[PDB]
Amino acid sequence: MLDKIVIANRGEIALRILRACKELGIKTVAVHSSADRDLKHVLLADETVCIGPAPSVKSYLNIPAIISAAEITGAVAIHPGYGFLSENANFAEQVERSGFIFIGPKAETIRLMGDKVSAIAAMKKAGVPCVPGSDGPLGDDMDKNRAIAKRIGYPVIIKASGGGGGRGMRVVRGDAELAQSISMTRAEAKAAFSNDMVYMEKYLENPRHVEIQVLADGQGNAIYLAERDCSMQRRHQKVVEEAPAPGITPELRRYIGERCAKACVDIGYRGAGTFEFLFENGEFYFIEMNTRIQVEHPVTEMITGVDLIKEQLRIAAGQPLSIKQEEVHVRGHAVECRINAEDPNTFLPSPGKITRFHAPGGFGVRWESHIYAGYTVPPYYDSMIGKLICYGENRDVAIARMKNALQELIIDGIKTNVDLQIRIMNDENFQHGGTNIHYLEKKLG
Ligand SMILES: Nc1ncc(C(=O)N(Cc2ccccc2)Cc2ccccc2)o1
Ligand SMILES: [Cl-]
């Protein structure tokens, strides 16, 4: 087992990782900004290192500082969590070049998945179903581009290769808008990603967002751990996630899961990863892969019993997966509600000091958060301050438990989305299940 690791993150995920480390007897180093001295996981860590002032650029994105902290403490590995540097291939490369273990895939794999065009080509080659599309970057020849659009059939969508997570894309419904749409997506991609490469896909009007969790070790084992529906979202920000995905049969699960695990083997994948699909009219279409552990991982843990962070750490130490595919069984149902410090009317971040706090409890209730009474939510970081995950023997029990748990949750002193989450749990279409990626925005409007 890894002797000591740096937790190169903050907030709830840093605490999640610290818990996994403690369970495994791994020493912890909490690197933190000067604004984050009183984070729960910082206070629980074996060693702490202040790596910079509040703004992320000089702390949680500060590569030299994070690597120096690993050097000075005698740490052997760095877990990037999610966000920040978790999908930064150059960081992963520098970490490994510096002699430390990066808890993630090989840097080349991170780079591959960060290049949406090359990722699609790799997945398509491996036998994973992808969205009908250009199968390559679009050039400047608008006769050729119209031809590609005709072949796919309108509506189409132009996406940035260096983009992802719903960012850097626009829908085109005919020839008249194609040139300008490509031109604009390209300009925006160059500005945001210093990469003006773009591609085309068939636009799917009302899909669900369904993603498959995988784990792969360095011994050649690769497994899938069912799926998550993350369709309840607002402006490419997930709000509620659940597992398994309603209406997905064990036969479909098996079909798509096996293809994802096959692709892992083909590409030499290692660690945790997520294959994102659009799911419409009973069909899966791969859009992108994430190499990090994600915010929504806990719902998968609840329905499979696999501790995904512990598996990450085991894999990095050179241990094989703790479970075989024939041992993975979907049992019950789990729902996650993200808890955000945000104003209900503007949806802008609402930082400040928490004056009263109470967490829910009971059977099937899991609360993932660093917050406590008297804790100040800083303005410098993301608005998500916690995750409430409820598990049941079925979806209706999970939802019932979530409603009860949301009613117990007290967070005074700041504005939160608890009321919104209660409305979602009480929503009759959500209660039916299978609502699409556009539902929440329509409901709110
Ligand atoms: N081929 C294709 N059709 C649609 C999409 C898409 O990626 N998105 C982005 C997205 C996916 C999942 C959750 C939230 C957003 C759907 C989309 C794209 C552009 C405008 C509205 C929705 O891709
Ligand atoms: Cl994530």
Side-chain angles (χ1 to χ4, degrees), residues 131-132 156-159 165-167 169-171 199-210 230-231 233-238 276-278 285-288 437-438 441:
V131 184
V156 305
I157 174 161
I158 313 302
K159 295 181 164 188
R167 298 174 52 208
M169 49 187 76
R170 51 161 50 72
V171 179
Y199 62 102
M200 193 183 303
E201 292 179 343
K202 178 76 197 191
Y203 179 61
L204 309 183
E205 296 273 9
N206 293 115
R208 291 165 59 189
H209 194 202
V210 180
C230 311
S231 301
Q233 66 89 37
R234 183 181 161 282
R235 301 187 153 180
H236 43 271
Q237 205 104 292
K238 297 174 188 74
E276 295 192 12
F277 293 87
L278 301 178
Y285 306 94
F286 169 87
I287 46 160
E288 52 197 86
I437 59 164
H438 304 296
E441 276 146 341

Side-chain angles (χ1 to χ4, degrees), residues 55-113:
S56 295
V57 69
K58 281 263 139 263
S59 57
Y60 302 109
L61 303 173
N62 190 343
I63 291 173
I66 295 162
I67 291 176
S68 298
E71 294 172 341
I72 202 174
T73 57
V76 306
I78 301 171
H79 200 314
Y82 54 68
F84 300 119
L85 303 165
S86 63
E87 303 284 8
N88 186 316
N90 282 348
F91 177 52
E93 186 181 347
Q94 289 173 81
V95 169
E96 296 286 355
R97 189 202 333 294
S98 298
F100 302 102
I101 300 172
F102 181 86
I103 299 154
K106 290 296 289 87
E108 285 161 44
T109 305
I110 297 169
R111 195 172 285 111
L112 170 55
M113 301 317 162

Side-chain angles (χ1 to χ4, degrees), residues 193-266:
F193 319 121
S194 275
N195 179 357
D196 77 340
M197 184 180 291
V198 298
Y199 62 102
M200 193 183 303
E201 292 179 343
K202 178 76 197 191
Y203 179 61
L204 309 183
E205 296 273 9
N206 293 115
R208 291 165 59 189
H209 194 202
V210 180
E211 60 183 31
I212 297 290
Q213 180 69 65
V214 301
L215 280 176
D217 63 23
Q219 278 82 3
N221 306 308
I223 66 184
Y224 62 93
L225 301 102
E227 76 284 359
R228 305 181 280 258
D229 193 320
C230 311
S231 301
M232 190 72 70
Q233 66 89 37
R234 183 181 161 282
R235 301 187 153 180
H236 43 271
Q237 205 104 292
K238 297 174 188 74
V239 174
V240 176
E241 312 100 346
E242 69 186 307
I248 301 307
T249 62
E251 312 98 78
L252 254 182
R253 179 170 302 109
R254 182 157 24 252
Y255 180 88
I256 195 61
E258 286 177 2
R259 280 150 187 75
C260 291
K262 194 267 192 172
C264 289
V265 172
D266 287 2

Side-chain angles (χ1 to χ4, degrees), residues 81-83 86-87 238 290 292-297 338:
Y82 54 68
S86 63
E87 303 284 8
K238 297 174 188 74
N290 307 308
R292 62 189 184 275
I293 195 71
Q294 295 197 250
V295 171
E296 64 270 14
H297 79 270
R338 299 190 182 192

